[PDB]
Amino acid sequence: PLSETKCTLKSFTVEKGIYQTSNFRVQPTESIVRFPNNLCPFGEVFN
Amino acid sequence: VDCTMYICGDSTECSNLLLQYGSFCTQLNRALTGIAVEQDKNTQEVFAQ
């Protein structure tokens, strides 16, 4: 995280202070598909 | 305001194209930071003399 700011100032000298390096994001663990709790009568057609 | 995320929600398909407009993404941050930096200079000189 220190090296990425020096690429923002383009300089090898980094003046005393606070600099804003590229943002970070939290990333998703998993997908959650949810559909409510008919059925097609394939037991009534095929059987 | 993060241009990359604002314009392109979390998606590289849009993120790639944004690279073609160059500094438009960054220089806004430079503008906003330019504001927010001095916003404390205002309060600096007004209240703390």
Swiss-Prot record, chain A:
Effect on the protein upon substituting residue 37 to Q: Reduced viral infectivity
Glycan attachment positions: 29, 31, 37, 47
Spans annotated as Disordered: 25-39
Superkingdom of this protein's organism: Viruses
Effect of residue 43 to H: In strain: Omicron/BA.2.75, Omicron/XBB.1.5, Omicron/EG.5.1
Function summary: Attaches the virion to the cell membrane by interacting with host receptor, initiating the infection. The major receptor is host ACE2. When S2/S2' has been cleaved, binding to the receptor triggers direct fusion at the cell membrane. When S2/S2' has not been cleaved, binding to the receptor results in internalization of the virus by endocytosis using host TFRC and GRM2 and leading to fusion of the virion membrane with the host endosomal membrane. Alternatively, may use NRP1/NRP2 and integrin as entry receptors.
Binding partners and assembly: Binds to host ACE2. RBD also interacts with the N-linked glycan on 'Asn-90' of ACE2. Cleavage of S generates a polybasic C-terminal sequence on S1 that binds to host Neuropilin-1 (NRP1) and Neuropilin-2 (NRP2) receptors. Interacts with host integrin alpha-5/beta-1 (ITGA5:ITGB1) and with ACE2 in complex with integrin alpha-5/beta-1 (ITGA5:ITGB1). May interact via cytoplasmic c-terminus with M protein. May interact (via N-terminus) with host bilirubin and biliverdin, thereby preventing antibody binding to the SARS-CoV-2 spike NTD via an allosteric mechanism.
Protein name, per record: Spike protein S1
The species this protein was found in: Severe acute respiratory syndrome coronavirus 2 (2019-nCoV)
Name of the coding gene: S
